[PDB]
Each structure stands twice: as C-alpha cells, then as structure tokens.
Design a protein around this nucleic acid. Structure first.
Lengths: 87, 101, 81, 162, 93, 93, 102, 85, 94
DNA sequence: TCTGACACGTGCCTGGAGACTAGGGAGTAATCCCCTTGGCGGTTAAAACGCGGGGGACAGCGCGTACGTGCGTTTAAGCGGTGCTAGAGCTGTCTACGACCAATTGAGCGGCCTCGGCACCGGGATTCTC
DNA sequence: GAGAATCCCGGTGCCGAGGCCGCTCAATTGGTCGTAGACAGCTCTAGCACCGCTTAAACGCACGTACGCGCTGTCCCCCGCGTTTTAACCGCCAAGGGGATTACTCCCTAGTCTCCAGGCACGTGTCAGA
C-alpha cells in the first residue's frame, strides 16, 4: 500500500496534521508565555502549512541521506544529521 | 493617455511609485526607476503565468490552482533558485523519484 | 489545565508525512524525535509571532504577523500575507 | 556603445533559429530553446554584425589598427548597452596571427568589416601573447562551430585547440 | 475598505495571452503575495545598494542592479532586456 | 580621510572592565564590523516592523522589539534588562 | 554634557542617531530609540569583549587576536546561534574531536 | 596591452592544498574522487560571488573592485565577512 | 622508524586546526579569481584586500563544507568521503 | 444530469495625473597622489612523482529483533447550529514630540613619538608507536 | 625500549599601539510649525465554547519478511617516505588605471492646488465537479 501511497500523496493536496490537535498544541506552547492568548483562524492554517512544508523538506532530506547510506530505513541519527548537516 | 499607458505596461506606475514613497524605502525615487520596475514585474508575471498555463494545459484544467503554480515554479530550474526559500500554500509537493528506490 | 496533548500528532501522521516525503520503510524510534522537532520549530515561530503581536498592540494573532515571522526566518509564506 | 546617443544609428534583429524577424526581441515567452541571437546593422550601407565575424578597430593609445574576431555579444548591460567580446589578432608590427584572449570592442572604433579568411587580408597561424607557440589553424573551421553552439562551449573548444 | 492590491491588472494581463483560462481565488492570493514579496526584496536591495555608495537618489540603474542580482540565471538577462523596452518607450513618448 | 569607525568607544568600554588586556587593530576592525552589522540588522528589522503596522516613527519600543526578535536565548532577556534600565534614568535626568 | 554621558554609557548616542538619520531608514526617529539602541549595542560589546578576555586568560595572552574572538563567538551557546552563518577573518576552527575519529 | 592569458588554471587550488583544507575539516583520509569536483564547486562559488562583486563595483561607475562591495555581496548571500567591510 | 599510517594524521589535524594561517596560496588564488572574472569581462582591476576577502570567504566555506562531509561520512560507518558525500552536502544547503 | 463560486456594469472618493516655483544633485573637465602589475635574481616551502604497505571499502549471510499489512473497537474527529463577548479596526482631540531655524563648544580622527608585546633563536623537557 | 611535533630562561628586532597635538564639525538649547498617536467612544464580528449527529481513523495484536549490523573474506588504494622540482616572496623600479574634492546647471521634482479617473463594495448570468 505504501508504494501506491507514494504517488497518491505526492499528487494529493489535503493536509495531514489534523487542525484540532495542532490548535491545542499551539495553545499549550503559547500559554507558556502569557495566559489567554488569541490566534486567528487563518493564522492556524498558515502555521500548519508552514509546518507541513518544513517537515516535508526534512523528510526528503533524510530520504536522500538514507539512500546515500545504502539503506531505506530512517532513524533518529538521520534527523540529527539533518540538523547538524545544514544547521 | 495614462502614465502606465504611455509606456504600454499593464501593471501600475503611480501605485508602485506611491507605495515606494510611502514604504519608507527611500526619500528619493527616480522617474525611470518606477517604470523599469513595472516592466520587470510585468515580464516576471507574464513568465510565471505562461508556466502556470503550460502546467495546467497538461492536467486538462482551465483554471490556475496553487498546485499548477508550484509545479510550474519547481520545473523551472532558474526560477526554482529564486523561489527556494518559500512555502506555497495548498500547492502540494513536486513529484520526484530517486535512483535507489 | 490542558496537558499531555503533545501526543496529538500521532505516529500514523508521521508515517503519512514520510510517505509524502518519498520513503518506503521507517523505524519507530523517530516518532519522539520528530515530535521534538515540531515542538522546537513551533516554539521558535510562536515566540516570534507573539513578539510581533505584543509590539502591534494586539492580542489576536492574525496571519500577517505569522507570515512576517516566517519571512524573518527565511521561510516566507505566500497567499496569507 | 555607452548611452543610446552613441548607438542611435543601429537596430536590433532577433534571429530565433534562422529568421530575420524583429518581434521586439523576447516579447513575452521564454522557455527551453533560448539559443536565439540578437544582431545589429548600420543604416549607412546595411552590413550586419553577426556572432563570429571579424572587424578592424583603432586603439586610442597604440594607434595602430588591429583586427578583432567577434566571439560573443551581450545586450543591455550596466556600462554599455551592448558589450562585444572578441579575439585579438597579433599584428606583425600581410599575414595576420590569432590570439585566444578576450577583449571588449567599442562601437565608435568600428569603421569597416574585415572578412579575413585563410590563404582583404590573410591569416597565417594562431599565436600566443608570449610571442611563440604558433599553430597553423585557420578560422573558417571554427566560425561555424561557434555559431552553432553556445559561447561557453566555444571558449572551452578554443582552449582545447590551443 | 482601503485595500490596495494588484488583482485587476494581473487578471487583465492574464487575458493578454490566454483569455480562455481563468484563475482561482486562492492561487491569486498566492501570486499577489509572491509579487509583493519580490517587489519588497527588489526595493530593499536597491535602497541598501544605493546607501552603500553615498547615493540617496534611487534611479533606474539601482533597480536594474537589484533585480539582476535577485533574478538568477539567463532569465535575468531577458528581464532586464524588457526593462529598457519601457524607458525607451517612456522618454520618447 | 573620514574613515568611520567605532574604535575609541569599544576601547573605552574595554578598559571599563579589562584595564590590563589590550586589543589589536585587526581585531578592532572585526569588532567594528560586528557592531555595524548588528546595528544594521536591528535597524532594518525595526524599519520593516514599523512598515508592517503603518508606523511613522521608530521609538525605544521599536528597537526593543527588534532586539527581542534578533537576539536569541536568555541573553536577549538580559539585553532588554540593560536597555530599559538606562531610559528609566535617562528621561528623569 | 552630551547625552552619551547623561545615559551613563561609553558608546556615542549622537553618532548612531546621526547615521541612522543619514542611513535612509526612517523619516522620524523617537527620542528613546537611540539611547535604547546604544544600551543594547554597549551590552553586546561588553559581553563579547568579556568573553574574548576570558578566552585570552586561558591562553596566557594579553592581546586579542581573532583566534580568541572566534572562540568567544562560538563557545557561548546562545550567542553563537545569532551568528549562525557568519565568516570571521583569520578566526580558525573550534578545538574538538569526535569519538568516532580516533 | 593585456598581453597575458592563463590556460585552464582551475588546478590552481592544488592537490595538497585540498588535502590540508580537508585536514582542517577534520577528516581521516580523502578519496581520489574529491580533488576533481571540489575545484568545480569552488569555481561555481567564485563565478557567483565574483559576478555579484563585479556588479557592485561597476554599478558606481568604477572598474576597481574594493573590499566593501565584496563584504556586501557576501552579506547578501548570507555568508557575511567581518573586518574587511 | 617509520610510523604506521594513522598516527601522524591526528597531530597533523590538530596542528592545522589550532592555528588559523592562510594555506591557499595567494598568487594562484588571485590568478584564478582574475581568470574567472575574465569570463565576465576583460580589463578589470583587483586589489589585494578584495583578493584576501575572497580567499578568506572561500576558506571558511570550504572548511564548513568539509566538516559537513566528514559528519556525513562518519554517520555512514565510513572514515573517508567520496563525490556522493559532497553531493549530499551541497544539495542540502543550496 | 444537478449544483456553489467566478466574473461584467456598476459610482465616487481617495488617489493618478496636469501643471508653476525653487532645493539640489551628477557627468561632464579639472589638481596630485593611491596601489598596483611585470619582472628583475634566489631560494625554500611546498607540489609531483615512484613505491611499499596496512586500514578500510566492497560483497554474501543468516541470525533477529523490528515493522507493514490484515484485522476489531473505540475515539476522537467532520460538520451543522447557536449564545455570546473580547477585541481589530473604524473618527476626533489635543497635547506631547520631530526638523529646523540662529548660535556655540567638546571631540575623534589626520600625523608623531614612545614605548610595548611576540618570534626566534642556544638549548630541556613532552607525551606520542610499537 | 627510546626519538621528536613544542615547553620556557631571556634579549632584541620589529611591527604595532597608546599617549600627545589639534582643529573643523556635528552635538546641544528650544520655539514653532507640523504631526501623529494614547485616550475616548463604538461597533460589529468572528471564533471560544458548547451541544449534537455522524464518521475516518488510531491502538494495539499476529505474522512473514525486507532489512542491518556484525562476521569473514577479498582487494584496493590512498598515505607516508624518499627523490626531484618549481615557482611564490622577498625589496623595488615606476609610470599608469583610477581615485581624495569643486561645480554646475539645468532639469528632476516636493509641494500644492489642481482636474480628473478607475476599480472595488456588489451581482445575477455562467461553469468545473459529483
């Protein structure tokens, strides 16, 4: 199913990270500064899209690293390199 | 008859001129500078719309969608460098397959 | 009041993101690490946007300050600002 | 030429592949296959300056006329509206030598086209600025090559010849 | 109210070559944001470059330099070739 | 002639806490360029941030927010702690 | 006296104010902006010079060559993040060896 | 004049120069498929940076490139240098 | 006696890593820069300060790239780098 | 074969041109210097070349813990409908704040000594490999 | 079973910096005209929050198998040592490309009335999707 999912997802457009968990996570990560902070509805979507783009880029980078490493399985060390290879 | 019509550019000249002067960018902006910027912006818009239409015609669609825009901007290699550090919203991703899968 | 919700982004979501990335096989040890990745990135962006909003004499974080913070970090976003 | 005042006697003709059209010059569409060329001709007699021809120009300091074979031209630059990169000919001071150095040619230094060929003059061999290492190589064999491909591979090719 | 955008002229030039096709509302915002960002980048680069040479008058040459630095590849050589098409049509007319 | 530099002030603040350790001219140029770069970054960030909210002037809070944006980590919390102190006794003097 | 002594610092408020005015940055500049900027710049300069002096004391040297300055700019873990992609002339490389090299 | 030309000086950054650069990098050994590609990478980086600096220096009616414009060009690319500008 | 391969390397690493002198030769680097700029246009004036700035920037960039490639190689159970490591390092930063 | 969004006439008011003074700046045409290539001769820190060698890259393997696919059951989600109140964005004050006009004075970078800190020596120890 | 890659006693060259001089130039005082936003009010609006009806998907349980890191063999190839070699830099000659500042003047234009203009708040007649 994964092989079909490859070009099912690269052709798809709908977002993957669900809006409600993302909203709650943003609320909890923002309350650590001030109590009762407000966010716009479109701001949440924009931030989620940015997170999507960043994570997709990171996963493409770790896929490149893995296929360079003569393997198809990514691990924590691969993402640690991804941080430590480009910053 | 208008300033934009004098140079034959669809994009505005007075609007960009006032946005430059009210934009806190320079106290002094030339006369040929706004028309040159208008011309280069019009050419860039024409090129990007040409690429978007070429991409859309291959998907059998008569409308410009962010997916088509991202596909067009990613296929173009010199335009990709300028649009490297951008995130297109609701545009998906560029399909690509390596030689190790 | 609201706690133990960092696990909102669950492991099938990471699996789907990996499939969009272009991989076939992923280990299960990367889920906590990618959760930390998301936490750190979102903390930085949220701090930038909150500073923007505090300067702007507002309390409702709109899309404009988020896009401006994204632009300041070299991650400019289009269609929203 | 510098400003448009010095280049008021020239026009622009855009050869996409083999045409003599104007079309303004890269009007709205740009895509793969951008090997089009832009050339200019004076209205006094109607002689065109193609990419691969040869002209003769006088030096402000040296004074003696020298033959330059045009290798490339770039339009709408910073200091000059057109910039012409050519290959200088090592004058003996009627056999002419050839050098691989790139030099800038100005508009007002051009008086008449020098259609030299292997034997209004004749060439002997390609030389070097050091004053030696001359190889009996003509120019008609490389004009077509430099006209058919991009200028980049043209300078790697001419470097490989030497 | 009081919203200055480039939608009308971009749409008109959209029917300048292919009037058969249209544009969606979401992609139009993407294009507007992109053109605004690139214009801001060009203006900032031109102002910063002018300030480096004790220059306070931004003219056509400063914008040309900023855009050619920002625009990569031979495409820039094309775009600059368009710019001088306008000023020559402006000073003469 | 008229070579702009911050050598004297950096040296004076160096003797404020380290009277014994000197500094070389080559390193002094490095510090001068560092100060100029940090200043330019803060100023351009403040100007862009003012342009975001249709602001017309750059006040103390503008640069405070700019340095909060640029300066990362606990050091930033110290910098403002040193900044707003001075103004606290600057206006009342 | 000048405002630099009034604020109790050693950096020129007047110089930064004049060059901000001449830098084509803002039509109007507030009164507290130059003094706040001078304060933050003086704090950064004091921090970097203190770090450079601490590095110099470890090497038993008095003159600050760019080596100790690079050590100061990279050792501090939040201060280095600011200069993420900077290039320092004659600065050098951090003294470290990964365990997977010996 | 300009009676001087160099023929393919791409190997100006010589083999043990690349070796010592890698040694500063912190490597144990370098394969033979590096010395031919690192020079190409350096050539591309120079073709970018020197072109930007040439545009900077010839914008202001100047043919002599200074260090200030080089520093500004590196700053524009996110690789700014301190103390030379 | 002759040292086995893998012991002079390490003190070599420290001896070039503690110091910060210029290793890339100034005159060849200046010639290469001049010839590269000649591909843009001839008759260009270069001063020593610009050449030094370019050499320092190239030095820093190449040291960073080599450190990145070393990290990539040691991540792959390897001690040497090949063209694949360089490509991986380059594609992920520009 | 049925839909929810997308696009032409539609007015005026904030904005784009129309047009007359005086700030005010640049490529023309000038001084003498500000750095710099070309090369003159030697050499010494490296750069090439040959050759021996040992750590390491390449390739098959079968153990072996680890995961995607197949599969219940919740479980939080996907959307429709409101009650509602904190707040972003609307005009108006007027009073605090910027530029600049006369006018003045301390300063920090052009030059010049007067010391001031480091390298390399004759010549010991320092932790390196086997 | 023992060498160097330097440490540190200690003098001096030797380039480099800290006082010493010193003087045009911008910092300082502050009405005045312009100007811009903290209050002052408001206003409408949109998502918090709740409630409810449906509903795609996660949490593991089981299992075959692609996969990964250590084993073991094979070769391989780049580095260290010895010999050759090779041109950069020293220290300058030396005029030449090009720059430190007037200047100007005349046209580019800020300001300001001034006259006009165009496109967005709508909108009902069409068109990609299921």
């Amino acid at each position: 199913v994964a092989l079909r999912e490859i070009r099912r997802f690269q052709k798809s457009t709908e977002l993957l990270i669900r809006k409600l968990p993302f909203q709650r996570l943003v609320r909890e990560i923002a309350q650590d500064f001030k109590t009762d902070l407000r966010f716009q509805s479109s701001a949440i979507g924009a931030l989620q899209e940015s997170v999507e783009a960043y994570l997709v880029s990171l996963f493409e980078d770790t896929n490149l690293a893995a296929i360079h490493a003569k393997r198809v399985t990514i691990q924590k060390k691969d993402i640690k390199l991804a941080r430590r290879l480009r910053g | 008859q208008s300033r934009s019509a004098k140079a034959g550019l669809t994009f505005p000249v007075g609007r960009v001129h006032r946005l430059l002067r009210r934009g806190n960018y320079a106290q002094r902006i030339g006369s040929g500078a706004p028309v040159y910027l208008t011309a280069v912006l019009e050419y860039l818009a024409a090129e990007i719309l040409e690429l978007a239409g070429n991409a859309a015609r291959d998907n059998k669609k008569t409308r410009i969608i962010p997916r088509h825009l991202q596909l067009a901007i990613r296929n173009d290699d010199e335009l990709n460098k300028l649009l490297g550090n951008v995130t297109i919203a609701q545009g998906g991703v560029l399909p690509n397959i390596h030689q190790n899968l | 009041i609201l706690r133990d919700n960092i696990q909102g982004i669950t492991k099938p979501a990471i699996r789907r993101l990996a499939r969009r990335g272009g991989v076939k096989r992923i280990s299960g040890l990367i889920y906590e690490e990618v959760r930390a990745v998301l936490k750190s990135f979102l903390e930085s962006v949220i701090r930038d946007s909150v500073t923007y909003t505090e300067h702007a004499k507002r309390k409702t974080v709109t899309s404009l300050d988020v896009v401006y913070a994204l632009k300041r970090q070299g991650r400019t976003l289009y269609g929203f600002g | 030429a510098k400003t448009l005042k010095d280049l008021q006697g020239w026009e622009i003709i855009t050869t996409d592949e083999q045409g003599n059209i104007i079309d303004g010059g890269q009007k709205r569409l740009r895509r793969r296959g951008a090997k089009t060329e832009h050339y200019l001709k004076r209205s006094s007699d109607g002689i065109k300056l193609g990419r691969g021809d040869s002209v003769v120009m006088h030096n402000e300091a040296a004074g003696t006329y020298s033959v330059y074979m045009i290798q490339e031209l770039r339009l709408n630059t910073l200091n000059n509206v057109v910039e012409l990169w050519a290959l200088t000919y090592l004058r003996w001071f009627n056999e002419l030598y050839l050098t691989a150095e790139l030099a800038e040619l100005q508009l007002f230094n051009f008086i008449r086209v020098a259609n030299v060929m292997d034997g209004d003059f004749t060439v002997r061999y390609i030389c070097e600025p050091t004053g030696e290492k001359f190889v009996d190589i003509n120019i008609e064999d490389v004009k077509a090559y430099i006209k058919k491909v991009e200028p980049r591979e043209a300078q790697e090719y001419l470097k490989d010849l030497t | 109210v009081r919203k200055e955008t480039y939608s009308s002229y971009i749409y008109k030039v959209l029917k300048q070559t292919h009037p058969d096709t249209g544009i969606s509302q979401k992609s139009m915002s993407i294009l507007n944001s992109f053109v605004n960002d690139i214009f801001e980048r060009i203006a900032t680069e031109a102002s910063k470059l002018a300030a480096y040479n004790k220059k306070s008058t931004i003219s056509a040459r400063e914008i040309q330099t900023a855009v050619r630095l920002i625009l990569p590849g031979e495409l820039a050589k094309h775009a600059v070739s368009e710019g001088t098409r306008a000023v020559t049509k402006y000073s003469s007319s």
